[PDB]
Amino acid sequence: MKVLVINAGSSSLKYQLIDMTNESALAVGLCERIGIDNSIITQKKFDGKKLEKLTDLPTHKDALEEVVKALTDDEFGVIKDMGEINAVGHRVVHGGEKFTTSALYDEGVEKAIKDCFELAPLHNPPNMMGISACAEIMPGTPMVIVFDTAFHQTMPPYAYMYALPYDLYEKHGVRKYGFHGTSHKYVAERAALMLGKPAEETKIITCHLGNGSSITAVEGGKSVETSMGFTPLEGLAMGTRCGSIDPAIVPFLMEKEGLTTREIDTLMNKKSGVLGVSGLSNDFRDLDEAASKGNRKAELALEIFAYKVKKFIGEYSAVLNGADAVVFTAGIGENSASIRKRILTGLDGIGIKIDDEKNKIRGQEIDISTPDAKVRVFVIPTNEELAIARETKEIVET
Amino acid sequence: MKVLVINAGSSSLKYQLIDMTNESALAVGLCERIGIDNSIITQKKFDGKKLEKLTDLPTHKDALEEVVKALTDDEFGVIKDMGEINAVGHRVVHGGEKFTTSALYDEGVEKAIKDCFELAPLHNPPNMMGISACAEIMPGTPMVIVFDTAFHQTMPPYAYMYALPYDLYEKHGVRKYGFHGTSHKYVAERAALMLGKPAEETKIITCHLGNGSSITAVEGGKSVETSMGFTPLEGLAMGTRCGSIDPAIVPFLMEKEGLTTREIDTLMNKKSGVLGVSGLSNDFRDLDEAASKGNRKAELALEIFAYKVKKFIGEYSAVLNGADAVVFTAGIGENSASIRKRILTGLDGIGIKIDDEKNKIRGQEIDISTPDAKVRVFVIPTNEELAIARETKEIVETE
Ligand SMILES: Nc1ncnc2c1ncn2[C@@H]1O[C@H](COP(=O)(O)OP(=O)(O)O)[C@@H](O)[C@@H]1O
Numbered sequence: 161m162k163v164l165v166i167n168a169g170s171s172s173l174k175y176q177l178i179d180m181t182n183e184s185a186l187a188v189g190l191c192e193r194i195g196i197d198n199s200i201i202t203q204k205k206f207d208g209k210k211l212e213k214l215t216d217l218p219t220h221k222d223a224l225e226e227v228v229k230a231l232t233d234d235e236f237g238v239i240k241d242m243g244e245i246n247a248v249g250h251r252v253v254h255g256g257e258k259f260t261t262s263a264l265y266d267e268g269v270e271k272a273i274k275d276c277f278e279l280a281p282l283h284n285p286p287n288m289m290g291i292s293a294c295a296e297i298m299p300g301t302p303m304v305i306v307f308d309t310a311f312h313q314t315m316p317p318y319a320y321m322y323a324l325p326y327d328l329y330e331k332h333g334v335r336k337y338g339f340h341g342t343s344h345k346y347v348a349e350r351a352a353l354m355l356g357k358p359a360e361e362t363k364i365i366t367c368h369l370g371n372g373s374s375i376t377a378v379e380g381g382k383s384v385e386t387s388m389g390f391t392p393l394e395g396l397a398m399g400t401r402c403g404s405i406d407p408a409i410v411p412f413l414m415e416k417e418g419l420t421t422r423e424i425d426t427l428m429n430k431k432s433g434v435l436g437v438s439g440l441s442n443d444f445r446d447l448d449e450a451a452s453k454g455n456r457k458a459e460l461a462l463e464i465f466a467y468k469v470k471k472f473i474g475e476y477s478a479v480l481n482g483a484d485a486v487v488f489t490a491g492i493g494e495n496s497a498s499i500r501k502r503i504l505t506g507l508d509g510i511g512i513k514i515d516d517e518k519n520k521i522r523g524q525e526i527d528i529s530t531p532d533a534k535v536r537v538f539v540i541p542t543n544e545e546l547a548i549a550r551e552t553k554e555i556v557e558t
Numbered sequence: 559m560k561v562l563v564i565n566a567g568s569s570s571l572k573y574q575l576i577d578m579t580n581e582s583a584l585a586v587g588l589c590e591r592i593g594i595d596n597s598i599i600t601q602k603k604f605d606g607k608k609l610e611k612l613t614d615l616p617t618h619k620d621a622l623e624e625v626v627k628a629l630t631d632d633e634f635g636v637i638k639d640m641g642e643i644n645a646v647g648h649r650v651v652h653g654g655e656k657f658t659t660s661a662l663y664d665e666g667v668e669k670a671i672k673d674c675f676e677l678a679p680l681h682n683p684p685n686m687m688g689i690s691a692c693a694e695i696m697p698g699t700p701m702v703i704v705f706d707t708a709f710h711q712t713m714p715p716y717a718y719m720y721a722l723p724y725d726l727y728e729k730h731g732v733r734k735y736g737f738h739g740t741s742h743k744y745v746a747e748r749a750a751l752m753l754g755k756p757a758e759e760t761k762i763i764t765c766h767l768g769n770g771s772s773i774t775a776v777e778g779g780k781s782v783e784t785s786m787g788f789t790p791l792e793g794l795a796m797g798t799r800c801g802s803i804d805p806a807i808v809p810f811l812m813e814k815e816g817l818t819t820r821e822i823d824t825l826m827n828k829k830s831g832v833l834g835v836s837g838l839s840n841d842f843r844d845l846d847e848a849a850s851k852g853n854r855k856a857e858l859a860l861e862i863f864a865y866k867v868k869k870f871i872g873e874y875s876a877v878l879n880g881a882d883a884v885v886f887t888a889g890i891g892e893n894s895a896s897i898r899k900r901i902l903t904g905l906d907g908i909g910i911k912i913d914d915e916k917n918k919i920r921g922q923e924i925d926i927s928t929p930d931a932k933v934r935v936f937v938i939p940t941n942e943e944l945a946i947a948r949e950t951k952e953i954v955e956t957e
């Protein structure tokens with residue numbers, strides 16, 4: 161099979177054509193300035209052959225037509241007919257809640273995706289401009305919609321429920337949903353491999369550390385617990401998010417600062433995290449340097465961040481009654497041996513130990529734990545497009 | 559010296575006259591339905607004598623007057639007159655960052671307590687009513703105040719700091735405070751003893767499960783982290799407290815129902831917890847009964863509670879890098895073998911096992927963990943009163 165993973169944008173359209181027989185990215189491209197002028201489409205064939213074309217792209221519908229022209233090119237393409245694409249994937253975050261499985265996008269899925277709109281204080285809704293374009297260009301083609309919150313639908317009631325009046329979950333659907341589902345599920349499957357055992361007999365703690373970070377407890381290959389909840393705000397302190405602070409602080413600030421419902425929300429999701437603590441930046445590579453340069457704020461901010469992730473490794477250690485391995489992925493988890501150490505140091509009491517040398521290695525699936533460590537600690541890079549591809553396949557297959 | 563410890567609530571008043579000389583508790587009482595119907599005071603003497611008086615108690619002032627009477631009863635009492643009460647130790651949950659240590663009562667302390675009301679709406683207000691009633695019945699008696707936040711004052715910056723705009727820390731003093739200190743500290747000392755090791759060489763997980771629940775990670779007899787934060791709402795789910803939910807739920811709920819900051823606050827501190835889930839009550843005993851009799855809401859309520867305390871045990875295990883013991887105390891943790899069984903089940907992976915039989919034992923300091931368990935699990939009754947008593951004596955004695 162061959163899957164085309166799409167990713168709609170404001171005025172762009174990223175794509176990948178993956179051959180699922182070897183999970184090889186045959187081609188990779190990106191459309192830009194869609195609707196705007198000076199439109200361009202850039203493609204890169206696996207065998208080192210980039211192609212650029214300056215054709216105006218009025219609508220993503222047209223842009224998608226060019227993506228096909230690029231794949232079909234015999235000199236810079238990788239497929240003769242458009243009929244070689246038997247599946248298309250699209251990742252969805254908000255509007256995805258309440259979906260236990262990846263839908264095969266039919267007439268009843270737009271509404272479903274259009275329902276979780278206002279529902280939950282979610283910013284940028286599902287950019288459908290790039291999804292509806294498939295129904296046109298290639299109708300007789302399977303289109304799967306991957307949900308970043310579906311992976312956590314296996315969580316038990318005593319976990320996704322809040323100790324709040326039951327009518328809230330019943331009247332507004334207030335429950336813990338979780339995110340980074342595709343990333344968490346991908347590395348999970350990977351970890352099980354490196355453990356040399358069936359995913360069914362493995363207890364893994366997956367750590368997605370990026371601008372928005374999230375931890376998940378993976379038992380027998382299913383999400384049983386996750387750090388985020390109703391919204392991505394719950395959980396670890398991250399780039400600009402506050403995380404799980406004292407709920408009472410929310411209304412407190414609103415009164416002491418004469419704020420609005422929207423002002424407090426912005427401050428927790430945009431003006432907080434390491435950005436608000438360091439007062440310097442939300443980007444970690446920057447905070448890391450500032451820190452080593454003697455910057456108190458930055459340093460403090462990094463201590464909070466690592467500390468919270470550490471606390472979570474422990475919290476999920478209980479939730480899973482013993483953890484076989486811990487996985488670190490995403491931007492921070494993959495390139496920062498610095499923060500990985502801050503996090504993993506001082507956990508030998510719970511079976512965690514890391515080989516400072518293997519830890520230095522960057523970008524590579526490696527087991528940075530010591531050989532005597534009771535718990536393995538893997539560093540697995542997340543391949544999103546490939547994850548969306550595996551999913552679309554699983555659906556189209558079954 | 560004989561100290562009188564007060565623990566006032568919105569309609570109750572737990573008192574206890576302790577004789578600091580030999581440190582023996584003379585009498586223990588409890589006033590209920592203060593301000594409501596069928597007000598009632600109860601007292602138990604050191605020899606088992608129980609008194610009960612059914613009289614109207616409109617204000618705490620009245621209740622306290624009746625306490626003096628109950629304490630000076632001819633046969634069921636312990637003192638001949640109010641004068642034998644040398645000092646009064648009062649409990650106060652929040653003192654602000656302006657008062658993080660026990661101190662003699664004066665207009666300054668009173669001001670601070672009155673201002674921290676918004677930081678402890680369920681407690682400070684009622685605690686103040688006690689200090690007040692106390693100033694009206696025994697104006698000539700010294701009063702020392704002990705704060706629930708003192709014990710956690712040793713938490714490191716990377717723990718009491720929230721990941722919010724730093725100026726909010728300097729501007730409104732927002733940081734984690736923690737509560738139930740007096741309790742956490744006591745049972746911690748006891749855990750060291752049961753371990754037969756010097757406090758400075760221990761790592762304990764103290765769990766105070768009661769109307770209000772909180773867990774603390776004590777390292778070397780020092781509070782390093784606690785479940786509650788700025789106010790007593792953060793942390794575990796409670797009788798009527800939601801605990802640490804998703805902050806983003808506050809603005810959402812507020813807009814979805816045009817709730818006001820005052821309202822949403824009331825919903826989080828009074829309508830949530832196991833009360834909100836079960837839709838039945840905040841009493842863990844009633845919930846325990848209802849659950850077993852087929853009540854799902856109550857069933858789920860206790861499930862959610864036991865699960866939350868479980869995770870913290872796991873959380874603070876990473877904080878202490880291997881805990882030496884997990885200590886259970888307070889209303890629930892002391893008496894509910896039931897709830898404890900829910901919490902401790904399925905933790906052998908992190909080295910925790912319990913002897914289901916020893917776990918049935920009532921209120922007694924007993925180690926309910928298997929002899930081979932890598933982690934001890936003591937069931938230690940709390941003694942907030944002797945603690946406050948000692949504090950009171952110290953402050954007053956030392957001028
Ligand atoms: N035998 C018991 N079984 C179950 N829960 C109990 C029991 N005894 C006490 N509790 C729990 O403790 C709560 C009150 O404890 P706490 O807050 O420490 O106050 P108090 O000073 O009255 O003990 C009760 O609402 C809840 O049921």
Ligand SMILES: Nc1ncnc2c1ncn2[C@@H]1O[C@H](COP(=O)(O)OP(=O)(O)O)[C@@H](O)[C@H]1O
Nearest residue numbers: 369370371372443444445448490491492495496
């Ligand atoms: N070498 C590094 N040192 C520190 N932080 C890094 C490093 N590499 C990546 N990061 C983190 O990853 C982020 C990358 O953002 P992005 O590519 O969108 O991925 P993510 O979703 O993981 O954040 C950077 O802002 C930084 O926070």
